[PDB]
Amino acid sequence: PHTYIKTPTYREPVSDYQVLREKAASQRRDVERALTRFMAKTGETQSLFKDDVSTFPLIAARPFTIPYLTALLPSEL
Amino acid sequence: WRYGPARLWYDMLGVPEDDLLADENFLMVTQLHWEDDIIWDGEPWYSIFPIDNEDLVYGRWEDNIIWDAQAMPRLLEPPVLTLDPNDENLIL
Amino acid sequence: LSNTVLPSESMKVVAESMGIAQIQEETCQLLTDEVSYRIKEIAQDALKFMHMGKRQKLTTSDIDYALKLKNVEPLYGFHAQEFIPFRFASGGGRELYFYEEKEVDLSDIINTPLPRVPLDVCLKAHWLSIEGCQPAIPENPPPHELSVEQQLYYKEITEACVGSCEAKRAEALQSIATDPGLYQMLPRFSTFISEGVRVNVVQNNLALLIYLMRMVKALMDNPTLYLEKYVHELIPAVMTCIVSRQLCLRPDVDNHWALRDFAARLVAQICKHFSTTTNNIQSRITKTFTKSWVDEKTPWTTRYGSIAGLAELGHDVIKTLILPRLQQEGERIRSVLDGPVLSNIDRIGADHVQSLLLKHCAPVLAKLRPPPDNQDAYRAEFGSLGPLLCSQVVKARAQAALQ
Amino acid sequence: SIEGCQPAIPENPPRLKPRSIHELSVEQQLYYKEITEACVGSCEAKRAEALQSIATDPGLYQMLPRFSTFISEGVRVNV
């Protein structure tokens, strides 16, 4: 065959619903954890424990001037 | 694409449409530390090898480097994105 | 080209509105060369109120000022806001166009919303040119989809690395370096970084380039994400930060020099972690650095970048690339020890190139020479590289003593 | 010639981006997997042919990165 036989070949496709659900779930959890840690580190922060910024940082609660606009209104429409 | 990734740059710009040169000298046998690689006292239906980036392996990316710049007359505006599916770790 | 008049068949139609049944063709020619003669005398006298009253529009008050000039009675009802409508009537052999006027109840003009009151003429002064070009005051002319969570994360992380404060930047870079799930946002970061390094050509900002290089250095330290599929975008951005010539806004005081050795260390790391024999990353990078260094006409900044990258690649590279062109130091010291021009910028860049060259060639001279090194400096170019080599041998002896 | 094609025997002289293919054929790599599994010397006649096959295959270029990488990587995790 090597003398004159050629077939293209492709990469192994992962069409499994279990591992696709796991990949999408873990990527969503990791990006939302990274986003919330970045936003809690670069702003005012609260803490459930005394002087606890590295582990479980909370974004501090800011008051709105008009709170029904950020509560009741839909953001994806 | 003006609204795609790099929209921030596009908005900041304000664009709105839409013999020592012989090949051997440079072969890394004649330019590298393989003397360290020597270890003294060590103390099919689908190709097995992973596909490489055809653009890096083949394309002339060197043509996107700039010879001269701030003091030069060229311009830019919104450009597209492509999403290569050969790379794993991309959900879509 | 020719004298253009109204058509003679347009006067048969007009003569039947009058009641004239049959009008011969010599009378119709007699009518249309007179009415198209009086049109051209009010077309050209309306143009004298369009030009003397500087308007370039020919409003309908220009024709009414010219009919007043030719003593003919005015045309009533052409100052209202209208346009050109026409309505085709097909018919059984009679083809024509008309107006199709409309009606309106009288109480819906008594109860229309009134327009806003006009303003009076006032004066405004502003500079148009100040001893030269125009100022940039606003009175002058100007010259697959990320989810909302990760869209917000992308927005906050990219706007934290633009330079409002340093602490949010350090937490954003410590986020990029140490999060597990930042894939699906790697192409956006690569596009952001490469386009932002490109935007340096419009605005020579050293600071934003240092911030983008610290963004790349933070992206490399992430254990979870693999930059193999996106390294073809980050390589020329760091290369642009190395071998471009104008990295500064004020060339003399801005330390473009550090964004040089930082990006050189970055590209040595990017071709240590990712160079494979299928990639040929390191050999291509060395070839670009080499043909930028050996080739003359290159500025001292880009030669500094080439020498910095080549010397951060390793010891054998500076053995087989830097050490053949050590005679080039003489060509450098042509423009350093010896003038006549001194107050140019070609001296600070030249002795920066000199200092980097002898700092990196001192351990190479310590590796491939005798231990004595009595007059190696004299044998070296300019006798300075040799003094640096003696200092390097002394430093190596001190390190051995510390060990 | 075999139905128009000249064989390489020693008696002869010489937006989503599309899903790419490996630069080796299935058979070009069947040769590889068989040659590498014969060259780890489970049987001596298998080795010796595989060594002669390496020693005189004309089309063994464009597979040579994968052979060099298999050698290099092997010795380092084999010492």
- Only one residue has tokens 């050293």, namely C206
CA-based nearest residue in chain C for residue D72: C277
For residue B51, the chain D residues in CB contact (below 8 A) are 20, 22
Q: Cα–Cα distances in Å, from C32 out to C10, C17, C45, D48? A: 8, 16, 20, 109
CA-based nearest residue in chain D for residue C279: D65
Contact A2 D31 (CB under 8 A): yes
Spatial distance between the Cα atoms of C302 and C242, rounded to a whole number of angstroms: 7
Rounded to 5 degrees, φ, ψ at A5 are -110, 125
The number of residues in chain D equals 79
Exposed, middle or buried, B49 (CB in 10 Å: 0-12/13-18/19+)? middle
Q: Are C39 and C66 in contact (CB under 8 A)?
A: no
Spatial distance between the Cα atoms of C286 and B67, rounded to a whole number of angstroms: 17
What is the separation of C-alpha C198 from the centre of its chain, rounded to a whole number of angstroms?
Answer: 8
Top residue of B9, B67, B72 to mutate, by most chain C CBs within 10 Å, is B9
Q: Cα–Cα distances in Å, from C117 out to A7, C108, C110, C114? A: 81, 21, 18, 9
* Position B53, amino acid: N
For residue D35, the chain B residues in CB contact (below 8 A) are none
* Subunit partners of chain B (3 or more CB pairs within 8 A): A, C, D
Contact D17 B82 (CB under 8 A): yes
Q: What is the largest CA-CA distance in chain C?
A: 128
Q: Are C378 and C386 in contact (CB under 8 A)?
A: yes
Spatial distance between the Cα atoms of D10 and D57, rounded to a whole number of angstroms: 8
Contact B81 D24 (CB under 8 A): no
Tell me which method was used to determine the 3D structure: cryo-EM
Q: CB distance from B38 to chain D under 8 Å?
A: no
- The residues near D10 (Cβ < 8 Å, ≥ 6 apart) are D56, D58
Q: Are C167 and A42 in contact (CB under 8 A)?
A: yes
Spatial distance between the Cα atoms of B28 and C283, rounded to a whole number of angstroms: 7
Q: Cα–Cα distances in Å, from B80 out to B3, C47, C240? A: 10, 51, 21
Q: Nearest by CB to A1, from D5, D9, D27: name it.
A: D27
Closest-CA distance of chain D to residue A13, Å: 11
Q: Cα–Cα distances in Å, from C321 out to B31, C282, C364, C368, D32? A: 8, 14, 12, 15, 37
* Residue C190 structure tokens: 């690569």
Spatial distance between the Cα atoms of C266 and C231, rounded to a whole number of angstroms: 12
Residues of C numbered 205-244 whose beta carbons fall under 8 angstroms of chain A's beta carbons: which are they? Answer: 224
For residue A46, give the 3-state DSSP assignment: strand
Spatial distance between the Cα atoms of A33 and A55, rounded to a whole number of angstroms: 12
* Residue B38 structure tokens: 């020597």
Rounded to 5 degrees, φ, ψ at A58 are -105, 135
DSSP code of B50? P
CA-based nearest residue in chain D for residue A1: D27
Spatial distance between the Cα atoms of C59 and C80, rounded to a whole number of angstroms: 12
Contact D31 A11 (CB under 8 A): no
Q: Cα–Cα distances in Å, from C99 out to C85, C86, C398? A: 7, 6, 104
The angle that helices C206-220 and C186-198 make with each other, rounded to 10 degrees, is 150
Q: Are C376 and C334 in contact (CB under 8 A)?
A: no
Closest-CA distance of chain C to residue D8, Å: 25
Contact A24 B91 (CB under 8 A): yes
* Residue A10 structure tokens: 């492709």
- The residues near C25 (Cβ < 8 Å, ≥ 6 apart) are C8
Spatial distance between the Cα atoms of D34 and D43, rounded to a whole number of angstroms: 13
Spatial distance between the Cα atoms of B68 and C271, rounded to a whole number of angstroms: 25
Q: Are C177 and A24 in contact (CB under 8 A)?
A: no
Q: Nearest by CB to A34, from C148, C168, C175: name it.
A: C175
Contact C192 B62 (CB under 8 A): no
Spatial distance between the Cα atoms of C221 and C179, rounded to a whole number of angstroms: 10
Beta-carbon-side half-sphere exposure of residue D5 (alpha carbons within 13 Å) = 8
Beta-carbon-side half-sphere exposure of residue C306 (alpha carbons within 13 Å) = 21
Final resolution, Å: 4.5
Q: Are C364 and C376 in contact (CB under 8 A)?
A: no
Spatial distance between the Cα atoms of B89 and B54, rounded to a whole number of angstroms: 18
Rounded to 5 degrees, φ, ψ at D21 are -115, 150
Spatial distance between the Cα atoms of A39 and D39, rounded to a whole number of angstroms: 57
Spatial distance between the Cα atoms of A38 and A36, rounded to a whole number of angstroms: 5
- C124 phi-psi bin (left φ>0, alpha ψ -120 to 50, beta other): beta
Rounded to 5 degrees, φ, ψ at D5 are -105, 135
* Position C18, amino acid: M
Picking from B82, B79, B81, B83, the residue whose alpha carbon sits closest to that of residue B9 is B79
Q: CB distance from A9 to chain B under 8 Å?
A: yes
Q: Where are the alpha helices (DSSP H) in C186-318?
A: 186-198, 206-220, 231-243, 256-270, 281-293, 300-313, 315-317
Any idea what the Cα angle at residue D30 is, between residues D24 and D35, rounded to 5°? 110
The number of residues in chain B equals 92
Any idea what the Cα angle at residue C384 is, between residues C378 and C386, rounded to 5°? 60
* Subunit partners of chain D (3 or more CB pairs within 8 A): A, B, C
